[PDB]
Symmetry: C2
């Protein structure tokens, strides 16, 4: 039995790619075509994950807003022949990562879980970003937790252990929920349960992690489906 | 248009802790204690907790507030040992009462009304797991939950308000602090926060002491969270917002 479900948010609960594609196209207009902007959004995510990987190996923490801003600036330099952005527009574009929309039925699935479980976010985004994403993605939590609180990013073990300490529960009483296998594996190393949510469109229409039945404790296509499997009414 | 977030004290400001713990203890202990006596211990319990936090603030130390509550209960049990007794298991159950606080009437809907215009967050000296639990017992839904435990310091230490502003990504002058205790508003304002005082005449019981708070001492002076929401121009619940 679990007392709390701890959720990855970007991708797991939110369509960040669609959000940032539409966000950037609305700000930039016909300065960019959809095909170019789609490619930059994919490279932007790659630079962010590359930087976080490097910071984790050094056991260091930076503002993730700064990570997104700096990588955008460097990508603008790479694509400078095709379009340009002002400094004010860099800030507005970077804001898009704090306006993520949820996958359909995520708000109702989250609400369904709360009859039996505490639900909390554990995200690498800054604390203020996940508060903002709560409004744009319509997510209501018992608690919001960020890498900023621990000075370390997932998958560092101090994030899961810090979350368990703050929540007053043992790591084995937390069910970690994510669409990324690395996160579940890291949480399980300290004892957490694991629930994998398939998100086939997380990275666009491309053709997926190798996740057979049994690799994780639960393997589902929606949060509502997980709530059903955990015995949550409705 | 001035504020981006409201930051709330919780115990007393939003919750009737005195009624909660009076009824909680009488249900655990039953006939072993009379209402008149248990009420007295509840008031003394709160006093010991406040005294211990005041001492830790001066030492700039932090410890689990559940432990503060538990240790002071054990010392009050010794003091009243001729009238009743409690097991170690019952000490844990009684100490749980501070995590089961019930809200004042209309607090949940006042809080929901504010969210049409503002981010709302708790800033409490209770441990993080305690305020999460109080959210269920008091029916409070937040944008964020913040605890002294995150900062290693209790209110009114400057680092709690500044830490909260840093985490929320907003300047202190864009935070409106909400409390029924003048000392909390005064400390938040020293960092730049706006101030909203909520009168709670029953916070300390039917004959509860009150503070001298005239018009103008704080930015807002109200009798309910819903009244505050109206003065900030939040639409009534049930509309498009």
């Amino acid at each position: 039995q679990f007392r709390a479900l701890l959720f990855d948010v970007q991708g797991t609960l939110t369509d960040f790619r669609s959000t940032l594609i539409e966000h950037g196209l609305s700000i930039l207009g016909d300065r960019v075509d959809r095909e170019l902007w789609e490619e930059l959004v994919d490279q932007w995510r790659g630079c962010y994950r590359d930087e976080l990987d490097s910071l984790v190996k050094q056991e260091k923490w930076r503002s993730v807003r700064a990570v997104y801003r700096d990588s955008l600036i460097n990508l603008l330099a790479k694509f400078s022949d095709s379009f340009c952005a002002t400094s004010a527009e860099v800030e507005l574009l970077t804001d898009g990562w704090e306006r993520l929309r949820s996958w359909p039925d995520v708000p109702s699935g989250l609400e369904q879980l709360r009859s039996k479980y505490l639900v909390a976010a554990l995200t690498n985004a800054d604390f203020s970003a996940i508060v903002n994403v709560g409004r744009s993605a319509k997510l209501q939590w018992d608690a919001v937790l960020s890498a900023q609180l621990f000075g370390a990013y997932k998958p560092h073990r101090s994030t899961y252990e810090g979350a368990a300490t703050l929540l007053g529960i043992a790591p084995s009483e937390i069910l970690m929920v994510a669409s990324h296998a690395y996160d579940l594996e890291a949480a399980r190393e300290v004892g957490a349960g694991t629930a994998y949510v398939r998100r086939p469109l997380e990275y666009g229409p491309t053709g997926t992690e190798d996740v057979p039945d049994g690799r994780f404790d639960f393997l589902v296509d929606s949060i509502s489906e997980l709530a059903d499997q955990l015995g949550c009414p409705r």
